[model samples]
Target: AKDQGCSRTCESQFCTIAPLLRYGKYCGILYSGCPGERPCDALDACCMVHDHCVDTHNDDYLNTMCNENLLSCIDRVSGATFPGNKCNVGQTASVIRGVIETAVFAGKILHKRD
Candidate 1:
């Protein structure tokens, strides 16, 4: 199957990550602090969006790859949330990790076939 861009709604809803992924690129954005006390708060929502994509999409490559990437992103965020990490409002490690994984998944979708 040929990989194409995500649905218009997906692109617009996840404005921060969707476009870059669709283009086989990455855009890492840190979660804002004022909106939530912890990085996980925003990450939770991000995960939700990706999860929705994974569930709704029929493309095997897109769904599986995105799910894998999302899991990795969640794991990284969980690690950052642990004690001794400096993942405060100013820190962007978790977000960057998520972006990298998402990009990798997108690249795979663009290049790989089942």
Candidate 2:
């Protein structure tokens, strides 16, 4: 998706530190932005688009395409080596987390495999 104007905002990295913000549980830390559009970075970018994708099914209820797509997108981020790997070391954890989330959605929520 193209950025209509690019919100480029993301989840607070330290959001979990606070109980209130933690309740939001939003994982835009990698790439928060407008619906179905590009976000701030590669990882969070995945989160935003996945959200928009799911929004459609949610009118009824689901995540097959969004869940798998989220996994694929974040997996690519995790797969990114060479440049940003040295400091951003939580990518592996992100992938595992994504796996669980996708499975959860697919198993109990999603309808179409898409």
Candidate 3:
């Protein structure tokens, strides 16, 4: 992909699907900002408009990632009462930890899959 300019090399030196996995795992460290309007560029890193950390192992990453941006955008567009303060790195990490724990507990209750 990188050779063809379909996508760029990531910070991890891994050829990513592009914006889908920029700044790999820890704070844009594994980044590959793809060129304009490419499908890879539209990939949506954990569903964020811009890059951010992605604790793939942590569940809080899901909640914070979804809630923070969703709420922010909703409030701005809908004129609703939204929570103050934008999401930050520390809070995202903490939230992701909790989410991971919850998923672990739930996984224990389900049958395993390949």
Instruction: Enumerate clash totals for all models, in the order shown.
Output: 0, 4, 9
lDDT of 3 by residue, 28-79 (tens): 3233344442212112233234232232435343344444453343233321
Question: What C-alpha lDDT does candidate 2 achieve relative to the native structure?
Answer: 0.45
Give the TM-scores of the predictions, in the order they appear.
Answer: 0.29, 0.49, 0.25
Where is model 1 more than 4 Å wrong at Cα? 1-40, 59-114
Q: lDDT by residue for model 1 over 1-114, one digit each (tens)?
A: 213432212111233342332111112222112211223334444444454454467534245556566656556543323233222421343444555567667867676864
Our tally of clashes for model 2 stands at: 4
Each prediction's RMSD over C-alphas, in Å, is 13.9, 7.0, 13.8
Candidate 2 structure quality by residue, lDDT tens digits, 19-82: 2221011243322355443343555555556656655675321445666676677666643422
**Cα-based lDDT for every prediction:** 0.39, 0.45, 0.33
Candidate 3 local Cα displacement, residue 40, angstroms: 16
| Candidate number achieving the greatest lDDT relative to the actual structure | 2
Query: In terms of TM-score, how similar is model 3 to the real structure?
Result: 0.25
lDDT of 1 at 43: 46
**Ranking of models by TM-score:** 2, 1, 3
